[PDB]
């Protein structure tokens, strides 16, 4: 089987412009395990983002957590871009506080 990824973005604390916080990107339910994950600030990559060790669920599908420090601003755009063999092109998921 091949399974396509599920992508969820969320912040650790409520947004308060100008205050440090943590942006997360949970990627789950995919197979095979070969995958590329990025977090973008204004559509450009973010260096030094960390992630959990690769693991799988009881139905054999894989999941990862990706996260990084960030300071949200009135006008800054944050997202999560994922590529996987199941996808005809890379998929982007924007973080919206509302």
Partner 1 sequence: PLSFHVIWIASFYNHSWKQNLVSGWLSDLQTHTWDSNSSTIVFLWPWSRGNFSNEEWKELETLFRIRTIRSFEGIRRYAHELQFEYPFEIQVTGGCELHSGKVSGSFLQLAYQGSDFVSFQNNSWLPYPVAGNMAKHFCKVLNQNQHENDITHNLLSDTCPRFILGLLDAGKAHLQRQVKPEAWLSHGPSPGPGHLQLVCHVSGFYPKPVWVMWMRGEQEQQGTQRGDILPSADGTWYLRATLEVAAGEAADLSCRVKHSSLEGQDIVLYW
The distance of closest approach from Cβ of residue 92 to partner 1 in the complex, given in angstroms and rounded to an integer, is 17
The distance of closest approach from Cβ of residue 19 to partner 1 in the complex, given in angstroms and rounded to an integer, is 14
Does 48 bind partner 1 (CB under 8 A)? Our answer is: no
Stretch that binds partner 1, among 1-9, 35-43, 75-83, 87-95 (CB under 8 A): 1-9
Task: Closer to partner 1 by CB, 21 or 91: give it.
Answer: 21
Token pair 């999560």 is at which residue?
80
Burial of 29 (0-12, 13-18, 19+ CB in 10 A): middle
Does 4 bind partner 1 (CB under 8 A)? Our answer is: no
Does 53 bind partner 1 (CB under 8 A)? Our answer is: yes
Nearest residue to 28 via CA among 9, 47, 1: 9
CA distances from 2 to 29, 50, 53, 80 (A): 10, 26, 21, 22
Nearest residue to 75 via CA among 7, 9, 13, 15: 15
Residues near partner 1, by CB under 8 A:
1-3, 8, 10, 12-14, 22, 24, 26, 31-34, 50, 52-56, 60-61, 65, 67, 97-98
């Amino acid at each position: 089987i091949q399974r396509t990824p599920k992508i969820q973005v969320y912040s650790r604390h409520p947004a308060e412009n100008g205050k440090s916080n943590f942006l997360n990107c949970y990627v789950s339910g995919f197979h095979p395990s070969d995958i590329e994950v990025d977090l973008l600030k204004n559509g450009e990559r973010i260096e030094k983002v960390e992630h959990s060790d690769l693991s799988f669920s009881k139905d054999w599908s894989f999941y990862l957590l990706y996260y990084t420090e960030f300071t949200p601003t009135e006008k800054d755009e944050y997202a999560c871009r994922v590529n996987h063999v199941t996808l005809s092109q890379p998929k982007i998921v924007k973080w919206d506080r509302d």
